[PDB]
């Protein structure tokens, strides 16, 4: 992402929607739900807050933080060696290796019995209220506004209170801005294309960046003169 | 305009000046409230238009904590509800329950069918919800125990019966208004000529229609008495 | 034209010359104000046209700092509001609140639903907002503490009731106008023949309609008395 | 960009909009929001002001300036060596290199504990009022005017107060001028095609211009005669 994510409260999206006199029955409560549907459906990893927590595994199980949304990596605390993924069907089960993890709910399922693990994860940024906080990006803000205008107009079109030409314009305009908003958040900055440059140009290919926290991923590869 | 100016236009359009007349201002008050919600539903229910501020009324409510069913422990959490019954809103505008400041608060008036499933979202648990139960009362609901301290809300909506919402009206700066007739009638001024035309058309024909004049233990209407 | 010329055309079109007549100039003042906003909404609400300067009125307001709810600290920031109630604007023109100079100032009249969510943008925090609360008063709002020093604004819009906005009118160079009838009636001169036709058509039929002439403790309208 | 960015106040866009009698209910307040949506959606880096600030990092964290919109580069103050990007998942977190940075809100997250860093960034140019200042470019000004005319007409088309032929003309005319305005600001001047010429024509390829502030990027490559 080229621009920085400056945070603003959710009611800044309601100044923009209630400029439209057909969207004047909108609420904070409706703006809360349609934001989280929009934040999810875009899947932009720049909208989330990166956190790291150390949890302790009791017997192939550990309790996961409350704010966790997606795990970046799980690693061991004493080694720093990262855990990949549990493909075993019979993991902590005895009959009569490379460590792994698996997460379903608020429980993580590891391959190690009694160990502390660091979990680097993503959460949602909150307010003084326990409410979501959105980027002030006028591309993000415009297409979140067009998201809610397209969900409200879809209800109104089912009711028969909106022209099919009106909904077709809103469905088209949200469809353009959703790609512009995707490209706004995905396309790297100059400082991220340098780390992409160093990963791409490697005379001796570095193929074990998952073992670290992808720390040396964008590091530059140097060759001695001889 | 007030209630009085709308009554006395329909009376004067019908020339119902006499005290010994068949159709009273109560026939006119009834028909003006019925033709207000008739006409607002004819304009504002097919496709969505801007509703003017004139069609709304703000009523004031006192809220009391009531149980879910009775005084039993395993029935569920208690609600707040209005101590008096609330008018039925029309589904054409922006109904709004607010804590005595219109520009503040998030109290959400919703459907009664929706309010039995609300607040299961972890980000929507500090929000107070409103609906009108079939009891006739406005009920309140949230997962936040703090909502049980509300003592008073105001309710701005386009209610179906304009007379019901004028007796529950908010106190003015000067004070309460004793007579319904000195209170504001809630319709846009652009809808008053179609409102007066339909109420006059309904009572114009019956205004000149015959009566059973004679006290003779017999119906004298087929004779046009 | 003034209010007087429009009253006395409809009276003379109906030939209501006699002082002992049923329909007074107050029946005509009422119907001219009702058919003004009826006719302006018929022309200027479907698709967007230029509105002439004749349909607007400028009213003068005194603003006072009022609390949000009451004198409590944790309720929220206070507002300014008009000390008297304001007329309801129509949604067809360019309403404009301005600090006694029309060509100056950024005071933004908006929806009441919008004004509870305004000024969260860092570049829109020195802008004063206006709306008409369901109290009937015009409220003011900004995040800038400087806005609480406004003592006076003028409000130019196409209000729904033309009589309400003529009693709140701005003082002239000469002085205030005592009688409503010597004040300017706010409609474009191209809409005056359709306005006079509808007010005359409403009162022409009832002008010749019979009355309950006899004082005999009986309704005499079915007999066409 | 070929032309210079001479700055004018936002009400110069309102002389142009209110020539149209259907746009006569527009405000400064509406011109402020629609400008910032337009400035963002175009993403022209010539509309922003380049600033440089030195901030001090306390422990892998530093406080970012208030006007910051996008970072050009972050570099170290004592060395001048530039920082690339944080790909580490477990950065300032201990267990039991090439420096980096990461920015989310008003906080920057670096790889260095106690260090001063220079941040070259972009901000918005303001007025005597704290309000945006726009280029006087009649291509920029025309397509910002067509932007606001297309957002106002989209509301009016939803209301049923505008013909679908009228909105289709405004959506077409904004669509042409938005590309003309993009090419007006992107296509280099003669003096920027010379620096592009020197980067492109390099017998010994210079592939480490990020380490400097891209200072020697457009420098000419000289070859000795032998």
Numbering used by the authors:
A (entry chain B), D (entry chain B): 1 to 96, 107 to 236
B (entry chain C), C (entry chain C): 1 to 225
Reproduce, without paraphrasing, sentences from the article in which this PDB structure was first reported.
The majority of the portal protein oligomer exhibits 12-fold symmetry and the localized reconstruction imposing C12 symmetry enabled structure determination at 3.09 Å resolution. The majority of the portal protein residues, except for some flexible loop segments (33–35, 68–71, 269–324 and 550–563), could be confidently modelled. At the top of the portal protein, an extended α-helical barrel (C-terminal residues 672–739) extends around 80 Å towards the core of the capsid. This extended feature has an internal van der Waals diameter of around 45 Å at the base of the crown and around 25 Å at its exposed end. The main body of the portal protein beneath the Crown domain is made up of the stem domain, composed of α-helices defining its central tunnel, and the wing domain. Tunnel loops, which are not defined in maps owing to their apparent flexibility, connect the inner stem helix (residues 519–541) with a 34-residue-long kinked helix that is part of the wing. These tunnel loops (residues 550–563) are likely to form a narrow constriction in the portal tunnel, as observed in portal proteins of other viruses. At the surface of the portal wing, there is clear density corresponding to residues 425–552 of the gp45 cargo protein C1. Twelve such segments of gp45 interdigitate with wing loops (SH3-like domains) of the portal, residues 337–380.
